């Protein structure tokens, strides 16, 4: 797993990065009330989400994470702040259903998908773990990014390269930490989306513009957010059965 050797860097740049704090608000937007519901927190990470989900008022939440040194790292945060959250290690892509919850939350995974294929086969996982009136929100690379319009590295995310991969593209790139952390990410097209996600079964869906806010824009000086308004490179996502 390309994040066993990143481990707490990840955290790092959750602290430093611009963007960070547009995808905590938007995602948070796009899931709304919490309370007492159960939540699946996908590819989660040192489990950011589904932590910060449980304090909100959630019933109970499970994570899922392919690096086993991040899934380390989150228990061992469960056990600092004593939280009941439980994690997991699987690949998404390939793994047997949890159950089905009320709410599945992915933030940076489907990014991960490294053929359509396999994009694909998350959608029918998530499906399979959400109840008939359950939903998805999900937190992705913007289908309409293009390196040659503007790197991303001011905001955290140095994007080093672009080449063509299956239907989409690949893109090596790195976190801007100290020292840089460096992976690898996929960029499916918004119809491969759209079609992953309709075979899959979910009937509903919309994108989620990020919640770029007045007060962002007032503490950096004017057009710092421009490329992040003409080039971003990320999205949110919404999808009910
Ligand atoms: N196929 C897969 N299945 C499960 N997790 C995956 C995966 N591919 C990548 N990941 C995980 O996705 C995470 C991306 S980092 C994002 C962490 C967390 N969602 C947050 O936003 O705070 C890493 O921990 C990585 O190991
Ligand atoms: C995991 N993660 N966190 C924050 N930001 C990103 C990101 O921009 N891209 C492109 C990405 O693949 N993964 C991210």
Same mark, same amino acid.
């Given at each position: 797993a390309r994040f066993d050797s990143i481990g707490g860097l990840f955290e790092?740049?959750?602290?430093?990065?611009?963007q960070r704090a547009i995808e905590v608000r938007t995602i948070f937007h796009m899931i709304g009330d919490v309370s007492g519901k159960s939540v699946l927190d996908l590819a989660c990470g040192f489990g950011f989400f589904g932590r910060e989900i /449980? !304090?909100?008022? &959630?019933?109970? *939440?499970?994570?899922?994470?392919?690096?086993?040194?991040?899934?380390?790292?989150?228990?061992?945060?469960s056990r600092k702040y004593g939280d009941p959250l439980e994690f997991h290690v699987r690949?998404?892509?390939?793994?047997?259903?949890?159950?089905?919850?009320?709410?599945?939350?992915?933030?940076?995974?489907?990014?991960?998908?490294?053929?359509?294929?396999?994009?694909?086969?998350m959608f029918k996982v998530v499906r399979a773990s959400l109840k008939p009136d359950?939903?998805?929100?999900?937190?992705?690379?913007?289908?309409?990014?293009?390196l040659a319009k503007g790197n991303f590295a001011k905001?955290?995310?140095?994007?080093?390269?672009?080449?063509?991969?299956?239907?989409? /593209? !690949?893109?090596? &790139?790195?976190? *801007?930490?100290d020292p840089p952390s460096q992976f690898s990410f996929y960029r499916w097209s918004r119809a491969d989306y759209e079609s992953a996600i309709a075979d899959?079964?979910?009937?509903?869906?919309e994108w989620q513009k990020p919640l770029l806010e007045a007060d962002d824009i007032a503490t950096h000086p004017p057009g710092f957010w421009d490329v992040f308004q003409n080039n971003c490179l990320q999205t949110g996502l919404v999808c009910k059965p």
């Open positions: 790092d740049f959750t602290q430093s990065a611009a /449980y !304090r909100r008022g &959630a019933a109970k *939440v499970v994570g899922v994470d392919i690096s086993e040194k991040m899934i380390e790292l989150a228990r061992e945060e690949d998404v892509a390939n793994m047997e259903p949890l159950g089905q919850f009320d709410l599945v939350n992915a933030a940076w995974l489907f990014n991960y998908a490294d053929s359509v294929e396999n994009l694909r086969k359950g939903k998805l929100v999900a937190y992705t690379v913007d289908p309409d990014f293009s905001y955290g995310v140095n994007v080093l390269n672009e080449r063509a991969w299956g239907p989409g /593209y !690949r893109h090596d &790139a790195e976190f *801007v930490t899959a079964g979910f009937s509903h869906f």
